Amino acid sequence: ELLKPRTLADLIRILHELFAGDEVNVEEVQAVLEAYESNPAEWALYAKFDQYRYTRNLVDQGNGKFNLMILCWGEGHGSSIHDHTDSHCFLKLLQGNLKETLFDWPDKKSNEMIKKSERTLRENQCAYINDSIGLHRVENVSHTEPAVSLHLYSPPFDTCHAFDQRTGHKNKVTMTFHSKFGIRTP
Numbered sequence: 001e002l003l004k005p006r007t008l009a010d011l012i013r014i015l016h017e018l019f020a021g022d023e024v025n026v027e028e029v030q031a032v033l034e035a036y037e038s039n040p041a042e043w044a045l046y047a048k049f050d051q052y053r054y055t056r057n058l059v060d061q062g063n064g065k066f067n068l069m070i071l072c073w074g075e076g077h078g079s080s081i082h083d084h085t086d087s088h089c090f091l092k093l094l095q096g097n098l099k100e101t102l103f104d105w106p107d108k109k110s111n112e113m114i115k116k117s118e119r120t121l122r123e124n125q126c127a128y129i130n131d132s133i134g135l136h137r138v139e140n141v142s143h144t145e146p147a148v149s150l151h152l153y154s155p156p157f158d159t160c161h162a163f164d165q166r167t168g169h170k171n172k173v174t175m176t177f178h179s180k181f182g183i184r185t186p
């Protein structure tokens, strides 16, 4: 029975229960993420920014079924176009706005990937992506407001592919945590 999380802690407890089994219910997960009201005090600790690019901050390793991490996007910061390694990927805005651009999987040819769709994700909004849906690029296009987001991936994945918008070629990148449980990890 899905309850409203009062707090991040609560949220994380509910997530552990939802992931106790081995097959997830995406809707239910998205609904509890959406229902958590962003409270900066509760996650301030994980919101470590870098001047030059966005940072991944590990919050919870999830008894091995999922990662939960906070990302921090300075003004004009953005990701590349990427997939999610056959995993589920939820994303909640805790603060600010991100622009998400979805691409279709490139065909084997070398041509400019073309954007399926585009949308702004607002605070507390929770979005869901997986590889059957497509690839996406997330950016903070704001010139004045940093953005912070909450990301859940299940199962956890170390690496993903990044795509060249031009040719659609892809590289395996190994995602690195800026911090882990509130501790900076170079």
Ligand SMILES: [Fe+2]
Pocket (backbone or CB within 6 Å): 082, 083, 084, 089, 136
């Ligand atoms: Fe992503």
